[PDB]
Design an enzyme around this catalytic site. Structure first.
Site, short mmCIF file in Angstrom:
data_model
loop_
_atom_site.label_atom_id
_atom_site.label_comp_id
_atom_site.label_asym_id
_atom_site.label_seq_id
_atom_site.Cartn_x
_atom_site.Cartn_y
_atom_site.Cartn_z
CG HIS A 62 -2.08 -1.02 1.04
ND1 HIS A 62 -2.12 -2.17 1.79
CD2 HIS A 62 -3.16 -1.07 0.23
CE1 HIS A 62 -3.18 -2.88 1.46
NE2 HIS A 62 -3.83 -2.23 0.51
CG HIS A 66 -1.54 0.26 -4.50
ND1 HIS A 66 -2.13 -0.65 -5.35
CD2 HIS A 66 -2.51 0.66 -3.64
CE1 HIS A 66 -3.40 -0.79 -5.03
NE2 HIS A 66 -3.65 -0.01 -3.99
CG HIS A 100 -6.90 4.52 -3.44
ND1 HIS A 100 -5.77 4.55 -4.23
CD2 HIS A 100 -7.04 3.24 -3.04
CE1 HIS A 100 -5.25 3.34 -4.30
NE2 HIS A 100 -6.00 2.53 -3.58
CG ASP A 101 -4.66 2.47 -0.38
OD1 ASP A 101 -5.58 2.32 0.43
OD2 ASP A 101 -4.40 1.62 -1.24
CG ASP A 211 -7.98 -0.73 -4.30
OD1 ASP A 211 -6.75 -0.61 -4.36
OD2 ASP A 211 -8.61 -0.70 -3.23
CD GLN A 263 -3.66 -14.27 -4.85
OE1 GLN A 263 -4.05 -13.74 -5.90
NE2 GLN A 263 -3.46 -13.57 -3.73
O1 LIG Z 1 -8.02 -15.17 -0.45
C1 LIG Z 1 -6.85 -14.94 -0.19
C2 LIG Z 1 -6.27 -13.55 -0.58
C3 LIG Z 1 -5.01 -13.09 -0.11
C4 LIG Z 1 -4.54 -11.84 -0.50
C5 LIG Z 1 -5.32 -11.03 -1.33
O2 LIG Z 1 -4.84 -9.74 -1.69
C6 LIG Z 1 -4.84 -9.41 -3.08
N1 LIG Z 1 -4.40 -10.33 -3.96
C7 LIG Z 1 -4.35 -10.08 -5.29
C8 LIG Z 1 -4.78 -8.81 -5.79
C9 LIG Z 1 -5.24 -7.85 -4.89
C10 LIG Z 1 -5.28 -8.11 -3.52
C11 LIG Z 1 -5.81 -7.01 -2.56
C12 LIG Z 1 -4.74 -6.64 -1.62
C13 LIG Z 1 -5.15 -5.47 -0.74
O3 LIG Z 1 -6.43 -5.65 -0.07
C14 LIG Z 1 -7.48 -6.19 -0.96
C15 LIG Z 1 -7.01 -7.36 -1.82
C16 LIG Z 1 -6.60 -11.49 -1.79
C17 LIG Z 1 -7.05 -12.72 -1.42
C18 LIG Z 1 -6.05 -15.98 0.52
N2 LIG Z 1 -6.60 -16.94 1.31
C19 LIG Z 1 -5.58 -17.72 1.81
C20 LIG Z 1 -5.57 -18.85 2.69
C21 LIG Z 1 -4.34 -19.47 3.05
C22 LIG Z 1 -3.15 -18.97 2.55
C23 LIG Z 1 -3.16 -17.84 1.68
C24 LIG Z 1 -4.41 -17.22 1.31
N3 LIG Z 1 -4.73 -16.13 0.50
ZN LIG Z 2 -5.64 0.53 -2.62
ZN LIG Z 3 -7.28 0.93 0.51
#
Ligand SMILES: O=C(c1ccc(Oc2ncccc2C2CCOCC2)cc1)c1nc2ccccc2[nH]1
Ligand SMILES: [Zn+2]
Ligand SMILES: [Zn+2]
Ligand SMILES: O=C(c1ccc(Oc2ncccc2C2CCOCC2)cc1)c1nc2ccccc2[nH]1
Ligand SMILES: [Zn+2]
Ligand SMILES: [Zn+2]
EC number: 3.1.4.17
Lengths: 305, 305
Positions: A62, A66, A100-101, A211, A263
């Site tokens: 963040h 970004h 925004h952040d 975002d 993911q």
């Molecule tokens: O759903 C997950 C997840 C994790 C991070 C995440 O962030 C992002 N990922 C890709 C693109 C964008 C984001 C944003 C980051 C900032 O806040 C919102 C999401 C998304 C899902 C996730 N669940 C898990 C369970 C065990 C181990 C690892 C895991 N990961």
């Molecule tokens: Zn953001």
């Molecule tokens: Zn944010």
């Protein structure tokens, strides 16, 4: 201004590069094509940008990079739907994205609540987001920093209202409700961009899309960006443990190996539905959804071996 | 209402069929689906539709069938760009298309002027088109026919003005300047749907696109519709000859075998530019441009033998 950037900045999957000192120029370039040359006074736009830079922190995800990245996604959406948006909306949304952040520490709203951080007591809902808007207003109030000085008061209040709604909508918790409302409205035919509340929701969805835009980049960018996201998440998980609280696997360092599945679940449940709904409403945003699907299948490939 | 019609009425190249007594039902299906069931009082709408039918004449091309065919193309443009139109545009545009050739005699504005017909003295410019609008107002003012009776005075005035401009825009003489202006507004990024005059211009082009929609049907429909166009045109050229005026080759049945070249010239000079420019502004209208290109080839094939 370099030849390769002029060409590739128009592409949805553009990466802004590792040279920090070029991101400000990249930003003014985008607002010159989007809004026009007479929209901001250059000297104070630059002063504003550098202040906003100074107020992003050295956190793994963040961060200033970004901010400029999200602003570019918004630019690509504005340029491919150039006919839909007002003079104020174009001014307001780039700036919103850039701010925004603002002043993000690397912690979620729930960590602030559990720590009992001062901000949590001030903002019961959308804690970090209300702070982001508050910071951007403080930066506008600084001497020489009101980039909207040329607007009427009536127009000034409109663009600050465009900016707050936009920043608040980056609270991913509000996205699920917003996307769902827009889905029913698009399918029934009630959706109408001449209705301000409907418009506010579409803009909200656009903010989410921008975002989350790391999932719409080419694989090597998406994959490398993922390291930065998790470094931040795991640091928070460590801090949950320090409070005596078991963090969710997402934030738990000891469950590195479940990242590929985690993911996958996120693309199916959050990312594909976001860009699917966005492409329905604004068909020219198709390449974001295309690139999302490509990364989905790249993550599926990581599961296998 | 029937299953095949429900599916194929969403296609841009849909033909409304040879059964006249289904056309009114087809039109109410269209307004119900693009406007809503609550936009109009059903009894008032059916009365309005029937007495609109009564005032179309038994003429080869500019008849009731062409009125509903033009309303359909408009419906298809609405449904694929639905998010862009006001509640007033959602009511007024299908009506405008239904009424846009009301009481057509089968003669051009040029013939009426040369004959010294009373309409030419009443309306110096866009003669038939001003008459079309005048007719739709007279029908709206018949007892039980004001389909807009529940609107406010303000809302009534401005939906009639929408209809007026749309109908006036069907004068093909006004299309050339309108398209040339919109092309420059699109190329320079000046074009914007929050500007009312830009909005009028685009609707005008949509109006031209719908009116010309026989070029966007499949070949067998386009070919057969050309027989009806020329039956009118040649009848006018006969009447020109009776005034002691040599008519242009377009309306001269003695030039029958130059029709293919005449069609080709029209596609290159008028039809392709129209749909090309419409597709730029409204990308979901692309199937119209596509069908027009296909028919462009068919006419080239006819030239070759
Ligand atoms: O759903 C997950 C997840 C994790 C991070 C995440 O962030 C992002 N990922 C890709 C693109 C964008 C984001 C944003 C980051 C900032 O806040 C919102 C999401 C998304 C899902 C996730 N669940 C898990 C369970 C065990 C181990 C690892 C895991 N990961
Ligand atoms: Zn953001
Ligand atoms: Zn944010
Ligand atoms: O350009 C012609 C032309 C003729 C008719 C025409 O009407 C349409 N054709 C296809 C689709 C739509 C139309 C509408 C009919 C009503 O008024 C506007 C045009 C177009 C070009 C044309 N030029 C000719 C020269 C010699 C012999 C025949 C010629 N035809
Ligand atoms: Zn006409
Ligand atoms: Zn017509």
């Amino acid at each position: 201004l370099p030849v390769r950037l002029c060409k590739e900045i128009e592409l949805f999957h553009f990466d802004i590069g590792p040279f920090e000192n070029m991101w400000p120029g990249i930003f003014v370039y985008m607002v010159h094509r989007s809004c026009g040359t007479s929209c901001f006074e250059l000297e104070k736009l630059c002063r504003f940008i550098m202040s906003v830079k100074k107020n992003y922190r050295r956190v793994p995800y963040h961060n200033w990079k970004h901010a400029v990245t999200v602003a570019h996604c918004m630019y690509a959406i504005l340029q491919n739907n150039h006919t839909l948006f007002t003079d104020l909306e174009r001014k307001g949304l780039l700036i919103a994205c850039l701010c925004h952040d603002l002043d993000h520490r690397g912690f979620s709203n729930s960590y602030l609540q559990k720590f009992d951080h001062p901000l949590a007591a001030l903002y019961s809902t959308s804690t970090m987001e209300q702070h982001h808007f508050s910071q951007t207003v403080s930066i506008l109030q600084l001497e020489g920093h009101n980039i909207f000085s040329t607007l009427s008061s009536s127009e000034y209040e409109q663009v600050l209202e465009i900016i707050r709604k936009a920043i608040i909508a980056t609270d991913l918790a509000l996205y699920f409700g917003n996307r769902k409302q827009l889905e029913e409205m698009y399918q029934t035919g009630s959706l109408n961009l001449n209705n301000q509340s409907h418009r506010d929701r579409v803009i909200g969805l656009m903010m989410t899309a921008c975002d989350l835009c790391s999932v719409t980049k080419l694989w090597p960018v998406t994959k490398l960006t993922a390291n930065d996201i998790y470094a931040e998440f795991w640091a928070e998980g460590d801090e949950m443990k320090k409070l005596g609280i078991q963090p969710i696997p997402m934030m738990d360092r000891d469950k590195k190996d479940e990242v590929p599945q985690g993911q996958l679940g996120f693309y199916n449940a959050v990312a594909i539905p976001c860009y699917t709904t966005l492409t329905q409403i604004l068909p020219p945003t198709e390449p974001l959804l295309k690139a999302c699907r490509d990364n989905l299948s790249q993550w599926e490939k990581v599961i296998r071996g």
